Amino acid sequence: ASKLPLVTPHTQCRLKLLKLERIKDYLLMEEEFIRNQEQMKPLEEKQEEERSKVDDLRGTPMSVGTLEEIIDDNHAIVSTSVGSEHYVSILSFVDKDLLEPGCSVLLNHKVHAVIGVLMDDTDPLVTVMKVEKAPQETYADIGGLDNQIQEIKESVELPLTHPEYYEEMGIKPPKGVILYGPPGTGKTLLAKAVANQTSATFLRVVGSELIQKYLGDGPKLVRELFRVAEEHAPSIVFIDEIDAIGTKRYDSNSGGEREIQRTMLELLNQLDGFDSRGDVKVIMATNRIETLDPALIRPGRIDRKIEFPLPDEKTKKRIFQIHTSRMTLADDVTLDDLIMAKDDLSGADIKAICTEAGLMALRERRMKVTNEDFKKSKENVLYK
């Protein structure tokens, strides 16, 4: 169990052999001196006899209850299920370290003393948002960009893989990243890829369900989210479409527009408040950046802002090349027509066109797609 982490020679050098002998001899003598006494002073089994006595102290029916207060001096105030609470003692074999106010306890049936602790198999909301499997394909599936990817890697991935450049430089890596631009140009896609390659736990939540239907709930949700985020490990949090809180109103919201302000103040404090942050990164994205509160974006809460422009003819060519890989297509088609199909077609129109034309050819149980198929497919998807 990590006896001696000084294994840094990691080679055929004499240091490793000598340290291994020293550990071996220490453990030899320790084994003899903690074994021979038990050979010569058993006095009882100590393997079942002591366990026999313990099983005797805790009577055969024993109840569950809730702890509510503790006085350190081995006896505390515990509640029963009915509602009336007591002032019982604490036995000594109960591991008086993992007792935290609220954990279930097992109480003796006669004198109600503290006997045992039940593991609290609850894990209620952790599993709802914590992504547990790789999203999809890495940076090889996205065509264009390159300038952006450099930055995302610098602010998210690179610190974890190579924590040697920065500390040598004396710089802490920049904190936050926001990605903004017109709709449907791959913000979420880059997020998925980053989740793919990375090693840290990835937590995702959409901004819209930050709002609720009762008072004093939004702040509770945000406190809980960041608590569970820092509970695990170096982790990455993704907050998506923030602008939704600041543009739409829903009747179920019992409060008015002031509770939204309260929620925003809570989130705004979570990033840089009175207490040490720990090791958590933040990534957020939106397509209306001119509506949210400029107090939220000041450096120290978010440093890199990356903008996503529309595709260009070279990138459009690359995109048509990517999205028709495993397509069994006839050489009759000419992509140059579709490149000039629209004045400013966006990236998602590409995948829309491809999938729709595939569907409409498969209508007739066929494998090859002709040109007139696209001629009707682009018209179907672009005009309505």
């Binding site: 169990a1 291994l20 071996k24 453990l27 030899l28 320790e30 084994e31 903690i34 074994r35 100590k46 002591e50 006595k53 102290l57 207060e69 105030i77 009915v82 509602g83 009336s84 609470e85 007591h86 002032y87 019982v88 003692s89 036995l91 000594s92 074999f93 109960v94 106010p101 097992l106 004198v111 602790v117 039940l118 920065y166 040598e168 430089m169 004396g170 710089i171 802490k172 920049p174 009762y214 008072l215 004093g216 709930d217 702040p219 302000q261 103040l265 809570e266 404090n269 408040g273 009175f274 207490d275 040490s276 400029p294 107090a295 974006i297 000041r298 450096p299 120290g300 440093d303 802002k305």
Partner: protein, 394 residues
């Protein structure tokens, strides 16, 4: 050469480690049990001296007493109310009315006093730990530091000068200025330096589900503070909890207003708190309520403004003194190149210059990095800046 020999030695010693680990006895993953060597004392004797001698002793709350002959009223949680007396081993003086007591289960007679409840959340709101920031990380604002330390800390460590001469020091202080200026950091500095307790509270923690909850929280907050000798309360982001009273039509913010009133009342009228100092902060203080800003509650109104010129060069000195950079660059020019900017921008400039050096291949940064960083974080991002809309204070 002999990798196999040394590796097999390592394997044998690891196996022997786990072997003797089983041999002594810690195995069989527990459902709440301690290793046998620890409870050896409480296997034969502690059971026999902690099962027959000690009783259950239910816990109850006392209602009142009555005269000339002690007779007491006991209220338990789900049973009846009783009329009881005391036991011989406990003195009759220390059973002051209205506190938890422990009574036996047969004759129902008082045995021992107990400490009262205090809610579970308000207990965790204490600090119990102190951050790492010190007083040397606030370059540029010596005035404010002197002024605040003279109200929040000086009387505690020299409580004779004021008593000798005959003054009572103030009790409050407010900190305000545009975002990014650096008030929360001053609060951290104060927390690091002090010795008495220090309870931190954030305004959004004082909005609750049901009606009349926030007021209760404020009451027991100040009560728990009173229990101790004397210490600090830091409030953050006030403007979420009380601005002004503007009721019209249907009720709006009424509950939050009641919370604000209770907070106000706790500091004034009928035998005030005494040995407690508060400390607040905000971003847009124009919305604070007049009755809250009246002196007697907020004696000093410390103000944090945008750094001038010694502030900028000095912030550069502080945030760049841990850099591997060129030995012959001047930061005064850098101070001149950014007219109105906050400490945050200087921190980000240092970071981005380091990143430009690490970008290509270099090991130590030079002047061109700084000039490019200033050209990008100041002039290129300036369409997402708060300060043109937080100097009119809204």
């Amino acid at each position: 050469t002999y990798s196999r020999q040394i590796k097999q030695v390592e394997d044998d010693i690891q196996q022997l480690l786990k072997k003797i680990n089983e041999l002594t006895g810690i195995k069989e993953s527990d459902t709440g049990l301690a290793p046998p060597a620890l409870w050896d004392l409480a296997a034969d004797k502690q059971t026999l001296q902690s099962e027959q001698p000690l009783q259950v002793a239910r816990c109850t709350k006392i209602i009142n007493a009555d005269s000339e002959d002690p007779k007491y009223i006991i209220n338990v949680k789900q049973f009846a109310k009783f009329v009881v007396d005391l036991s011989d081993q406990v003195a009759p003086t220390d059973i002051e009315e209205g506190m938890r007591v422990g009574v036996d289960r047969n004759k129902y007679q008082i045995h021992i006093p107990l400490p009262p409840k205090i809610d579970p959340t308000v207990t965790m709101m204490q600090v119990e730990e102190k951050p790492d920031v010190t007083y040397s990380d606030v370059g540029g604002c010596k005035e404010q530091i002197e002024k605040l330390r003279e109200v929040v800390e000086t009387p505690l460590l020299h409580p004779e000068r004021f008593v000798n001469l005959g003054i009572e020091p103030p009790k409050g202080v407010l900190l305000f200025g545009p975002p990014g200026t650096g008030k929360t950091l001053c609060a951290r500095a104060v927390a690091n330096r002090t010795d008495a307790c220090f309870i931190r509270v954030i305004g959004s923690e004082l909005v609750q589900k049901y009606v009349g909850e926030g007021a209760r929280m404020v009451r027991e907050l100040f009560e728990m503070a009173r229990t101790k000798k004397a210490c600090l309360i830091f409030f953050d982001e006030i403007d979420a909890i009380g601005g002004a009273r503007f009721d019209d039509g249907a009720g709006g913010d009424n509950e939050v207003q009641r919370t604000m009133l209770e907070l106000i009342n706790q500091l004034d009228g009928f035998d005030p708190r005494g040995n407690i100092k508060v400390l607040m902060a905000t971003n847009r203080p124009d919305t604070l309520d007049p009755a809250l800003m009246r002196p007697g509650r907020l004696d000093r109104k410390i103000e944090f403004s945008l750094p001038d010129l010694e502030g900028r060069t000095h912030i550069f000195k502080i945030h760049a003194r841990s850099m591997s950079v060129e030995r012959d660059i001047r930061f005064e020019l850098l101070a001149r190149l950014c007219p109105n900017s906050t400490g945050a921008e200087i921190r980000s400039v240092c970071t981005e210059a380091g990143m430009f050096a690490i970008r290509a291949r270099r090991k130590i940064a030079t002047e061109k990095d700084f000039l490019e960083a200033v050209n990008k974080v100041i002039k290129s991002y300036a369409k997402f800046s708060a300060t043109p809309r937080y100097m009119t204070y809204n």
